[PDB]
Amino acid sequence: SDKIHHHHHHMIEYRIEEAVAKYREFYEFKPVRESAGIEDVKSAIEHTNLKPFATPDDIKKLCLEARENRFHGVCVNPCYVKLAREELEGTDVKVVTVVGFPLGANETRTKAHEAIFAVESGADEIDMVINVGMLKAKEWEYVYEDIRSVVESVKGKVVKVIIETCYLDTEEKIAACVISKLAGAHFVKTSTGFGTGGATAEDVHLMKWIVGDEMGVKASGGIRTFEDAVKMIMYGADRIGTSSGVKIVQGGEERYG
Amino acid sequence: SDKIHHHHHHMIEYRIEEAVAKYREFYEFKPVRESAGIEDVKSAIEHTNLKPFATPDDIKKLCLEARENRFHGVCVNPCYVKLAREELEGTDVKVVTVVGFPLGANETRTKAHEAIFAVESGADEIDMVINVGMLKAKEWEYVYEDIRSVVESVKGKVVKVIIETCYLDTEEKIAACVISKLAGAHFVKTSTGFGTGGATAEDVHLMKWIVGDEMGVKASGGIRTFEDAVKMIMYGADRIGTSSGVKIVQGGEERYGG
Structure with a gap:
């Protein structure tokens, strides 16, 4: 009902404003x-290969690298979820895939179906992209329902919301976090790696500050070295999204081992 | 069954080899x-805005520009098909959207559902992305079924297959066109605009030469000027994917007249 959705849109706006007011009065940037x-x-x-040209052999190599290095999980496009699941069968390495990715501009029902299909094919977790255009137009109820539909569709599984920090101002980053939390998502995540910018310590910390200890932040996009990964964790990242995990581990062992 | 899929995979391989043979023996690059x-x-x-930060207002402006300039269509992300249809009601400007876009790496059923939903919402045509990685792995039957399932799911609507030429060698561009044609698609298209390169006259002509006069080629990615648009059409493009349509038209009028 319009009445119900209009009221709900209003309560989201007030929650966003509350967060912005608290940020303005109390926020400070420092390590966690x-x-x-x-x-x-x-x-x-989360050891990642989302390249459109990745082959089945590339995915097999990615899963092998995750086993060898004891990474938390792999992250692959939806067409390769079944393959990743078979390659990792018997291990604790998670299979993560991406939904509505990287543009976030699919119909909500397509995102919800893609998520359901991914879990059925063996995904443990879903990283979805927010509808950035609708967030920028302040259509909070649309953005809310878009995330909520995905969360409810795979309830019991972890959903991370990519907010695509590179296209947002400070208040929009705050709004994205607040809406993702209200919708019952488990993580917010900085970047698709297909935009104009990637993870910054400033964005990661703001995100963790807004969402609190009980919700995860995943830093992604441009994390190439051990020093990059350490910085992101020190400022509040719970997970890293990268395709450079092999070099990250080698740099850590070489320079800090 | 697996025997039937196996036999069909082999059939496709033979069609690709025949097309490559013809290309090696007879191909010549020149204008059409x-x-x-x-x-x-x-x-x-096809006047396009697929930016993830596009707002409803941006889409309304896009549709206005398409009416003002009498373009063939607009191309918008699926969330905005119903908006574009409303904005264009009473005109014959087509509403085009994109499926499995830009990475082409969704499960086939997800592409097929997305296409059905887009047609239900009011799309006239669908531009889908080929699964590039499975093409590069020579999994011809996978690539065929991925396209065919979409085509059949929206029977009666035009389907274009984006082959994403920037990641393919010459033989793979040929294979992508042959497969797209066999699977019943109506057009092949050069580029998503989210890869490492866009349309070239050499790619457009090669694709038109392989698919022939009853299938379309849409040139897309990096088409900025009137002169660029003219070039692509001269070498075999039937459609142009661009966001620079306003400057393209103004440019042609200023330099060459109405």
């Missing part, structure tokens, strides 16, 4: 952790 | 048409 070691970095890494 | 005017360019343009 003293340090981060090699094992902490491995445990945070 | 001696020129193109402003009315030709307008008729070819």
